[PDB]
Design an enzyme around this catalytic site. Sequence first.
Site, PDB file in Angstrom:
ATOM      1  N   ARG A  10       1.074  -1.061   0.268  1.00  0.00           N
ATOM      2  CA  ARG A  10       0.083  -0.096   0.034  1.00  0.00           C
ATOM      3  C   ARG A  10       0.575   1.378   0.172  1.00  0.00           C
ATOM      4  NH1 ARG A  10      -3.039   3.961  -1.371  1.00  0.00           N
ATOM      5  NH2 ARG A  10      -4.908   4.590   0.648  1.00  0.00           N
ATOM      6  N   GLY A  11       0.312   2.117  -0.298  1.00  0.00           N
ATOM      7  CA  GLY A  11       1.663   3.878  -0.346  1.00  0.00           C
ATOM      8  C   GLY A  11       1.738   4.120   0.963  1.00  0.00           C
ATOM      9  N   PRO A  12       0.253   5.565   1.512  1.00  0.00           N
ATOM     10  CA  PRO A  12       1.058   5.529   2.945  1.00  0.00           C
ATOM     11  C   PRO A  12       0.651   4.733   4.098  1.00  0.00           C
ATOM     12  CG  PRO A  12      -1.517   5.847   2.591  1.00  0.00           C
ATOM     13  CD  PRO A  12      -0.673   5.099   0.825  1.00  0.00           C
ATOM     14  N   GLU A  77      -2.499  -4.218 -11.169  1.00  0.00           N
ATOM     15  CA  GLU A  77      -1.711  -4.716 -10.908  1.00  0.00           C
ATOM     16  C   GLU A  77      -0.669  -6.308 -10.222  1.00  0.00           C
ATOM     17  OE1 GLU A  77       2.873  -5.572  -8.804  1.00  0.00           O
ATOM     18  OE2 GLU A  77       0.412  -5.235  -7.929  1.00  0.00           O
TER      19      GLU A  77
END
Lengths: 170, 170, 170, 170
Positions: A10-12, A77
């Site tokens: 995940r990003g953040p 993805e």
Amino acid sequence: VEYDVFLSFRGPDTRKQFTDFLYHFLCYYKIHTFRDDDELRKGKEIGPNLLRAIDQSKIYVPIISSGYADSKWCLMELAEIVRRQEEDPRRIILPIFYMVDPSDVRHQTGCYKKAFRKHANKFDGQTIQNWKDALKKVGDLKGWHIGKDDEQGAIADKVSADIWSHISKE
Amino acid sequence: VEYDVFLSFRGPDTRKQFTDFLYHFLCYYKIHTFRDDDELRKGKEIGPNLLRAIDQSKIYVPIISSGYADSKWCLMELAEIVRRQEEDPRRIILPIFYMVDPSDVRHQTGCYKKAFRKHANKFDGQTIQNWKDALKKVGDLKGWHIGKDDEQGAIADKVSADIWSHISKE
Amino acid sequence: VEYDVFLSFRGPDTRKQFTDFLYHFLCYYKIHTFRDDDELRKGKEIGPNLLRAIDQSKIYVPIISSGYADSKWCLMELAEIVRRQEEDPRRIILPIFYMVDPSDVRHQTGCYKKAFRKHANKFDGQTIQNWKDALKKVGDLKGWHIGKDDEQGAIADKVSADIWSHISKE
Amino acid sequence: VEYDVFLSFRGPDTRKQFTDFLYHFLCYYKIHTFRDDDELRKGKEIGPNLLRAIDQSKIYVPIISSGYADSKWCLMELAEIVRRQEEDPRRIILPIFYMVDPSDVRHQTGCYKKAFRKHANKFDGQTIQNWKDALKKVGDLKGWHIGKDDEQGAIADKVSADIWSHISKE
């Protein structure tokens, strides 16, 4: 000279919380690791970056988190990871659940419900069924669950050697 | 003619619910499986029964449950599994958590505190530390978590083939 | 290419508890099995789904549970099974009682009383008599009772072959 | 001119209550039925009587009762039924449980524990294991359970035709 391990997260959420230590700890076992932070968005799927390393990787090791089902760039993805894996079973997948049950991943219920409550108003009515078919099979392989109390440090050392055992002995 | 898989579980909890199918579904893949129900107690540790099959087994596959930490026989028997495994790493261990977190197994807290609250008034002050040292390392390997909603049937088929994949390909 | 076995059960009770393994164990005998989880409600009775497979099935095998008499969909659907069976006796029915007596099924008393009393304030005074006439005759054919101690695994293997014996020998 | 159905039951329990009607109702379907009341004891196993009709029968239909596990003659005789059946599967078995659970028959516990508590002080330590191996497999086939409320009359008519259906159609 090529990549032997490819991550995904995940990003953040866990970009500095825990995956970062694993990247720095892993490099101490003399293996080249790939992690990426560029938000892409330059189109819809980049070739010379992600698509190149995907076929170049050797052990795809995702890291499913709590909010891994919202970013419209991660799921589609992941649909390319488990799909390429099913064609050649020479490679493997070692998922690592995180702060979530190993039950909210096989049926997309619980903390994912509302995520797919709004994702169904944009895309096709078949592309979504493609994700839920791929995201499900990931939640059936082996995986170290990390509960609220497990040491975020001892797990890293235990999981790293299992990635290093499949390289030295080959 | 010998045993290639050896199980271990709780008595009244999962003897007739989930583990029973594992014995009947697995026999459909033409492999000999060992499960035992005799309460032993004829002494403190039987030789020609348990001790024989332990060295004869090939893939020790425990099934940790919710109340797996109370029966005096189980723990001290598990201390003989993971100990024999550390001497010869030719064999493996594929634990399967059940209705419990993968965090209440590395530190014996939560639903096990009441268990070791009374187990410390009978035995030695070192034998208990021997169990907590062995029970911990089990909760670090790979393992299919079974949440409250996961299908008790699809998991069986997925886990069985992973035991059958290490036999045909060898 | 068509369905040779059609199931029917309760929603939350036995959808993962036991009926799930049977769908996975049965597929190992090379026969196509139909089970459905869609809550329907899109109208009052769907055609191309349930009504199609009903006439396409070959051995209707219900699984009566403890709370099988509450869901407004199940009973009226069972009224379509045993009714279609009485017209052509070429097919059969092999009910399997579950955690209930084979006496609370012929007279709807015991654990069905209050639910039936509530159902009588909505529907017709003849449709209810249609269910109690159909639900009764089901509790007269042959059936494996599963008590509190019987192995949930050995029963599956024993009952599956009895479904596979009527296919190979025809 | 020969026997097509052979019964077996308890002495004082169901000789005059329910099984007696089965002999009188069944004779109304023009089939020859065999039931016997002679206490034998003239030796240990009579030939021209029981052993003759056993091989002459066509559908062995026992009737397990509540105290069917005490008479020293019944069990060892049942061990000859299910054993002869396993050699030639041309014939069948249609057990009928009675006032007992279909769970106290697969593990000899409950109301049979007192029975085998005293039977183990006379005979061999292997002959008893021969009974428990044969008595178990009987409690896995199909069978009409008769609860406390089911009609002792309607069941008879329903079960009789199922014996008459396998004769006319052959």
